[PDB]
Amino acid sequence: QIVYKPVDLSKVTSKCGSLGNIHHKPGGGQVEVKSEKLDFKDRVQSKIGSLDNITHVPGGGNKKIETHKLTF
Amino acid sequence: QIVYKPVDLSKVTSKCGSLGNIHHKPGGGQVEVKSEKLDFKDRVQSKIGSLDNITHVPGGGNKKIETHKLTF
Amino acid sequence: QIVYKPVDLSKVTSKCGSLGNIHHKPGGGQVEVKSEKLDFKDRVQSKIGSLDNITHVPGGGNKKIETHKLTF
Amino acid sequence: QIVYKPVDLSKVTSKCGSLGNIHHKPGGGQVEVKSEKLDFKDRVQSKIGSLDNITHVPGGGNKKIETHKLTF
Amino acid sequence: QIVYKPVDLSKVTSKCGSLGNIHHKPGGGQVEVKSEKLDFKDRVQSKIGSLDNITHVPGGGNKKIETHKLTF
Amino acid sequence: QIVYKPVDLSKVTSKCGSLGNIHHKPGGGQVEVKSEKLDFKDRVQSKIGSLDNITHVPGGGNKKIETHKLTF
């Protein structure tokens, strides 16, 4: 008699990219008089209090190769 | 007699990209008099208090290859 | 008699990328009179109080190769 | 001429009670053979690996009393 | 001439009770053979791996009293 | 001419109770054979690997009393 009962009970997780929490609070203080004068003239690039979150995940893949043979 | 009963009970999860929470609160402070003057003339790029979230996931795939043979 | 009963009870986790929490609070202080004059003229790149979070994950993949053979 | 323009720009916050994070991981280790025999017979009180979080806040109230008078 | 124009721009917040995160993961470890035998007979109280969160907030109230008079 | 323009730009915060993070990891080690025999007979009180977090906040209140009078 032969019994062939291999059991895959496994658990696999991938968690990839921007996982953590971001808190961005620019200008959260106290001021009496606030004045901003912006003069931008030629080919200017500007970020003021902005948030860019850029995420690339080519990875994070799960791969199982499993071979079962019984030869009698 | 032969019994061939391999069992795949496994669990596989992929979680890929922007997973975390974003909190963006620009300008949330206290001000009495606030003034802004913006003068932008030629090929200016500006972000003020804006949020960009860019997510690319070519990955995060799950792949199973499983071969079963019994030869008697 | 033969019994062939290997059990994969394994647990595998990948956690890859920006895992930690970010707190960015520029300008959170106390001031009476605040004035800003910005004059940007020619091919200027500028960041003021802005947040860039850039995450690349080509890794963080999980791979299982498992071969089972019983030859009688 | 009289101008009566007192300005309340104030910000008030109360944050009272269980503010912090609790992480409770009883039994998170590695064991080959684990056995537990519990025999509790008369007026026994028992906690095993349980979490009680009890919060009472009679406080944390915010109170403003403000009186404005102009007598001419 | 008289102008009576007091301004309340104020912000008031109460946040009272169980504010923080609870993570309770009893039994998250690794065991080969696990056995538990429980025999409880008379007026026994038991908690095993359970979570109680009890919150009482008689407080956390906001109260504003504001009086305005102009007498001419 | 008279101008009466006191400005309240104040910021007030109360943060009261259990503020800090708790990490409780009982039994996180390595053992081959673990056995526990508990026999509790008469009016026993027992805590094993349990977490009690008890918070009382009758305080943490914010109070403003402000009086403005102009007599002409």
Author numbering:
A (entry chain C), B (entry chain A), C (entry chain D), D (entry chain F), E (entry chain B), F (entry chain E): 307 to 378
From the paper:
Residues 297–391 (using the numbering of the longest human brain tau isoform) constitute the proteolytically stable core of paired helical filaments (PHFs) from the brains of individuals with Alzheimer’s disease. Here we use time-resolved cryogenic electron microscopy to study the in vitro assembly of recombinant truncated tau (amino acid residues 297–391) into paired helical filaments of Alzheimer’s disease or into filaments of chronic traumatic encephalopathy. At later time points, the first intermediate amyloid disappears and we observe many different intermediate amyloid filaments, with structures that depend on the reaction conditions. At the end of both assembly reactions, most intermediate amyloids disappear and filaments with the same ordered cores as those from human brains remain.
The first reaction was carried out in the presence of magnesium chloride for forming PHFs, whereas the second contained sodium chloride for forming CTE filaments. From 180 min, we observed multiple types of filament in the PHF reactions. As is the case of the Alzheimer fold, these protofilaments formed a turn of a β-helix at residues 337–356. However, whereas the Alzheimer fold is C shaped, the ordered cores of most protofilaments at 180 min adopted a more elongated, J-shaped conformation. In the different filament types, the J-shaped protofilaments packed against each other in different ways. Among J-shaped and C-shaped protofilaments, the opposing β-strands comprising residues 305–320 and 365–380 hardly changed their conformation, confining all differences to the β-helix turn and its surrounding residues. We observed two main types of J-shaped protofilament, as well as several other minority types of J-shaped protofilament. Earlier J-shaped protofilaments tend to be straighter, whereas the β-helix turn in later J-shaped protofilaments turns inwards, towards the rest of the protofilament. In the PHF reaction, some earlier intermediate filaments also showed a similar extra density.
